[PDB]
Design a protein around this ligand. Structure first.
Ligand code: 4U6
Ligand code: MG
Ligand code: ZN
Length: 888
């Protein structure tokens, strides 16, 4: 069935109180539930219909009268229908006892078992897999939850709210009662049982001086990997206090790591549950990225406490209101904590590669969709990351002072209530009126950011009159028509701009944000002493395709002398892209015309000189340096090429890398050697509280340079690779594995790094990723080895994703013209879909670009998708996803 946003209507029923008894046993979990219910004003005497998926009914009742199946109710394993004539017309109690088995729940939705932990996951529609409920976010209720289990196996019992009772039970069992008086939607319900060890701390709030108990949990084996997460939690609480003036309102907050998790983490009230790879880390057993990952994910779930938990959603179409806004708050947090420009750059890099691809694919949708079949296919990079950019633009338009005012209005006005995207825009509009100093100013046009799909294209024309010292910027915006909107409307686009004097590299004007509200506009500047080079969309001030129309000479100057990190980064990107497009077409024509000889346009020499200039600047950011020596992501490039021949693009990249390498390899090597001391500094290796993001960036640079030098077969570089494998940092000795791919010492380091990784679950998954991403000619044989020797029949999403997803980024091998890469992944998708439809859909990501490739590869991918579609036992999740992707 298809749900439509305009069709929203309040339920005809009210659920005031939920009283749960969850009794966990060896071969079953018995769930007893009493729902104190009422009749709403929207009731028209309809049947009482509960959500309830895969529940085994022992008994159901109304006001303690046992109901008879068939006569008074029906249950089709999805909906429990109680005929209206048996439904009371005033306040009543609905009770039920059902049986579920978390032990065999491999979908990881509802209540399930992860190794030796019983854990729940209810967003979005997972609560209905635990007990009967009107499973929607506008059904707010109070929760009284009791959990019982075997004491030896599950000594630690957790749920939302305050633990009010702990008691022993005959037969070596024990129970714990949790009462949570504040109203909440059921997707925020959580329960955890297991042999958990913890680290703890006490946090005192900034303004009201409230004592908050912080707990982080994991299995005993990995308790030593919990410290950084605890630090991140404290940092998160501090930032929301310092930036937004928001304090935590509960007495206790628990973070819990589990090994089997479909996503990163979940913001269950007082009981945040994490993928282990997004909470656990140690410097000996984790790559550098884990530390940024944990900071962001812990921060993300914490910021949800206000934007998501205290102010909730009216319905699932408003998802971006809590997700886009929280990612935004998460990004502000991370930028403040890392104090490096690459943090912002990394988010732009992800958006413009992954989300832009989605936005131009058949899966394209606005951040607030008008319809859905599977809400499990709703949680997208569009909703999250474009949503975050849409939320961030409010800040750019209003400035920090008035944004904080607007955000405060939103929280104060909607605290303890459901809300919609209109509620947030309204709050922002109030601050906009204050800032603009007139009550006529509005943000009605801004709502189009929520409803209109596709990536806007913004192009520029420039003119300078030396006589009148007058400079103008003519701006045009354009969004391609798609299946969502035949006619696209102009958006409110904020363009943060600077003007650089090309003669001395100085700023010519103060900080300025151009407010483009029409299809096109001309912005004029007086008293401009000399023809400037425009610095456009500073900080990437809008989620758009930027077409600056600058010469490479101008882009080089910005790269060298502009103040804004993104514009420098983007100028470099634009120089690369122009080169990539030119060489691609040259290679393409040669292939098509079967030429015996042809010419390639060399890489701009002045550009190479500029890279060398920045690399040799001691005061330049190391992380920034790693970006400029790296070509744009393949998934970014494909947005600019029709019928992309992946082999030709691979040839293009290889030529460009070799050209730059032929001039800069000596510089690369010199830097790789000189960076070693600070990058691999071991001083704080045994201090899990000391995290230096600048240092980790230096390792990123070294490992990027090492990769370039290895591919280039730089003289005696194998020696460097061998010594690199002896480094204590996993980021280094895992890099040594992947860069050794070009040498016969590869399988030696394969065995060495495996032995180092095999005893840590998360580290082994990083090893799998490194092997999967290895630039090997025998990569298919290697994958077969991974399946037979390591992966086997594991149902762990982390294991499966680790083995297969990095390989799909192998431009040359995954897109083998035989189609065997497409066939391989499709088999894994179909296989995975049998027990975990959600992860199966995640594994479909490489097919998202299917209609952007050359016609042969289009046919190959389409055939595999249609083959998957013809699987008799295909899930609703996978089917709907593939149907949309293939325009059926
Ligand atoms: C930060 C990251 C995106 C990695 C994450 O962990 N997000 C979760 C979140 O919002 N935590 O607060 C997240 C991501 C997806 C989902 C979700 C919920 C329901 C369905 C689906 C789904 N079907 N994805 O394909 C995905 C739930 C939580
Ligand atoms: Mg403070
Ligand atoms: Zn979230």
């Amino acid at each position: 069935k298809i749900h439509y946003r305009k069709d929203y209507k309040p339920s005809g029923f009210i659920i005031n109180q939920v009283t749960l008894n969850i009794n966990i046993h060896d071969q079953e979990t018995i769930v007893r539930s009493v729902l104190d219910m009422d009749i709403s004003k929207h009731n028209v005497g309809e049947d009482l219909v509960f959500d309830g998926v895969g529940l085994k009914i022992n008994e159901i009742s109304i006001n303690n009268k046992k109901l008879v199946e068939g006569e008074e109710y029906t249950y089709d394993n999805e909906f429990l229908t109680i005929f209206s004539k048996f439904v009371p017309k005033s306040k009543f109690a609905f009770s039920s006892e059902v049986i579920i088995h978390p032990e065999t729940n491999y979908a990881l939705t509802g209540l399930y078992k992860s190794k030796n932990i019983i854990v729940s996951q209810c967003e979005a529609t997972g609560f209905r897999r635990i007990t009967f409920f009107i499973d929607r976010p506008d059904m707010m209720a109070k929760y009284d939850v009791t959990v019982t289990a075997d004491k030896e196996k599950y000594p630690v019992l957790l749920s939302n709210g305050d633990k009010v009772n702990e008691f022993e039970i005959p037969g070596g069992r024990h129970g714990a009662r949790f009462n949570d008086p504040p109203l909440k939607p059921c997707y925020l319900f959580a329960v955890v049982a297991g042999d958990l060890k913890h680290l703890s701390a006490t946090y005192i709030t900034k303004y009201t001086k409230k004592k908050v108990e912080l707990y982080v949990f994991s299995e005993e084996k990995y308790v030593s990997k919990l410290q950084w997460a605890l630090e991140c939690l404290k940092k998160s609480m501090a930032f929301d206090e310092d930036y937004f003036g928001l304090e935590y309102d509960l007495s206790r907050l628990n973070l819990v790591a589990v090994s089997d998790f479909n996503v990163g983490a979940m913001e269950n009230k007082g009981l945040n549950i994490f993928n282990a790879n997004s909470l656990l880390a140690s410097k000996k057993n984790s790559i550098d990225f884990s530390y940024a990952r944990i900071l962001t994910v812990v921060g993300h779930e914490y910021f949800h406490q206000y934007t998501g938990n205290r102010v909730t959603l009216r319905d699932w179409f408003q998802l971006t209101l809590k997700e886009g806004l929280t990612v935004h708050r998460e990004n502000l947090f991370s930028e403040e904590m890392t104090k490096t420009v690459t943090t912002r750059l990394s988010h732009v890099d992800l958006l413009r590669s992954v989300q832009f691809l989605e936005d131009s694919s058949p899966l394209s949708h606005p951040i607030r969709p008008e319809s859905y079949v599977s809400m499990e296919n709703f949680y997208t990079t569009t909703v999250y990351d474009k949503g975050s950019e849409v939320m961030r633009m409010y800040l750019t338009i209003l400035g920090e002072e008035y944004y904080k005012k607007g955000f405060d209005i939103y929280i104060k006005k909607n605290d303890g209530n459901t809300a919609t995207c209109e509620d947030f825009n309204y709050a922002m509009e109030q601050a906009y009126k204050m800032k603009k100093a007139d009550n006529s100013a509005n943000l009605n046009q801004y709502l189009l950011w929520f409803s209109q799909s596709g990536t806007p294209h913004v192009s520029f024309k420039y003119n300078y009159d030396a006589e009148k010292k007058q400079y103008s910027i003519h701006v045009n915006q354009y969004t391609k028509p798609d299946e969502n909107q035949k006619e696209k409307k102009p958006l409110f686009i904020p363009i943060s701009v600077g003007l650089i004097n090309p003669e001395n590299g100085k700023e010519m004007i103060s900080q300025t944000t151009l407010e483009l509200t029409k299809e096109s506009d001309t912005f004029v500047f007086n008293n401009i002493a000399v023809k400037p080079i425009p610095s456009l969309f500073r900080g990437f001030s809008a989620p758009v395709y930027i077409e600056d129309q600058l010469t490479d000479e101008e882009r080089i100057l910005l790269l060298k002398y502009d103040s804004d990190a993104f514009v420098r980064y983007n100028s470099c990107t634009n120089i690369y892209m122009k080169q990539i497009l030119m060489n691609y077409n040259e290679f393409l024509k040669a292939k098509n015309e079967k030429l015996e000889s042809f010419q390639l346009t060399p890489v701009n020499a002045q550009f190479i000189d500029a890279i060398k200039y920045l690399l040799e600047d001691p005061h330049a950011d190391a992380g920034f340096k790693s970006y400029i020596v790296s070509l744009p992501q393949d998934r970014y490039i494909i947005n600019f090429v029709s019928n992309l021949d992946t082999d030709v693009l691979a040839d293009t990249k290889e030529y460009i890398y070799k050209q730059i390498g032929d001039k800069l390899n000596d510089v690369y090597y010199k830097m790789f050697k000189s960076l070693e001391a600070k990058a691999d500094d071991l001083t704080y290796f045994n201090d899990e509280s000391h995290v230096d993001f600048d240092q980790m960036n230096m390792r990123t640079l070294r490992n990027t340079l090492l990769s370039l030098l290895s591919k280039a077969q730089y003289p005696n570089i194998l020696n460097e690779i061998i010594e690199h494998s002896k480094s204590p940092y996993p980021s280094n000795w895992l890099t040594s594995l992947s860069v050794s791919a070009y040498f016969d010492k590869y399988f030696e380091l394969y065995d060495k790094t495996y032995k180092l990784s095999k005893d840590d679950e998360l580290l082994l998954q990083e090893w799998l990723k490194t092997v999967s991403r290895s630039d090997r000619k025998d990569i298919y044989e290697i994958l077969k080895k991974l399946e037979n020797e390591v992966l086997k029949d594991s149902k762990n999403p982390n294991d499966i994703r680790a083995v297969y997803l990095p390989f799909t980024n192998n431009l040359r091998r995954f897109h083998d013209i035989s189609g065997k890469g497409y066939k391989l992944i499709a088999e894994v998708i179909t296989k995975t879909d049998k027990f975990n439809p959600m992860v199966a859909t995640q594994l479909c990501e490489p097919f998202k670009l299917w209609n952007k490739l050359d016609t042969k590869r289009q046919e190959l991918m389409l055939n595999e998708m249609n083959t998957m579609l013809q699987e008799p036992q295909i899930s609703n999740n996978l089917k709907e996803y593939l149907l949309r992707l293939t325009n059926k």
